[PDB]
Design goal:
The protein is globular and about 35 Å long. The strands form two sheets. Strands 1-6-4-5 form a four-stranded antiparallel β-sheet. The longest helix is centred in the last third of the chain and has 12 residues. It has two helices and six strands; from the N terminus they run E-E-E-H-E-E-H-E. It has one domain. By secondary structure, it is α+β, with helices and mostly antiparallel strands. The chain binds 5-bromanyl-2-(naphthalen-2-ylsulfonylamino)benzoic acid (2 copies). One 5-bromanyl-2-(naphthalen-2-ylsulfonylamino)benzoic acid binds next to loops. Involved in the signal transduction pathway mediated by multiple Wnt genes.
C-alpha cells in the first residue's frame, strides 16, 4: 500500500474561508468531509473530500474530538497570515 502526504500553503489573500467541513474524531482520525466551491481549499484544488487532516499551522489533529477540531480551525482562520494544511491522500 502507498501513502501520499501533501503540504498545502494558502495565502488567504483572495479568500476569507477555507470552505471545508471535517468528519471523524482522533480521541477515540479527522477527514475533509465537504469542500465548498468558493473557498481557499477549492481554489487550490489539491485537497479532496476523504483526505485525512494531520496538521494545520502548529496544531496536530491526531488527539482531538470533532468539536475541538472545528474550534481550532475557527481560531486559525480568524488569525492573520497564511494557513498550511498537511493531509494524507485517500
Ligand atoms: O471564502 C471566501 O472568500 C468566499 C467568497 C465568496 Br463571494 C463565496 C464563498 C466563499 N467561501 S466559501 O468557503 O465557499 C463559503 C463560506 C461560507 C459560506 C456560508 C454560507 C454559504 C456559502 C458559504 C461559502
Ligand atoms: O473557513 C472554514 O472553512 C472553516 C471550517 C471549519 Br471545520 C471551522 C471554521 C472555519 N472557518 S470560520 O471562519 O470559523 C467559519 C465559521 C462559520 C462558518 C459557517 C458556514 C460556513 C463556513 C464557516 C466558516
Amino acid at each position: 500500500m502507498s501513502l501520499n502526504i501533501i503540504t498545502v500553503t494558502l495565502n488567504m489573500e483572495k479568500y476569507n474561508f477555507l470552505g471545508i467541513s471535517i468528519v471523524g474524531q482522533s480521541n477515540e482520525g479527522i477527514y475533509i468531509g465537504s469542500i465548498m466551491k468558493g473557498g481557499a481549499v477549492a481554489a487550490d484544488g489539491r485537497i479532496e473530500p476523504g483526505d485525512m487532516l494531520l496538521q494545520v499551522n502548529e496544531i496536530n489533529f491526531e488527539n482531538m474530538s470533532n468539536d475541538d477540531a472545528v474550534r481550532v480551525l475557527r481560531e486559525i482562520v480568524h488569525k492573520p497570515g497564511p494557513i498550511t494544511l498537511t493531509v494524507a491522500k485517500s
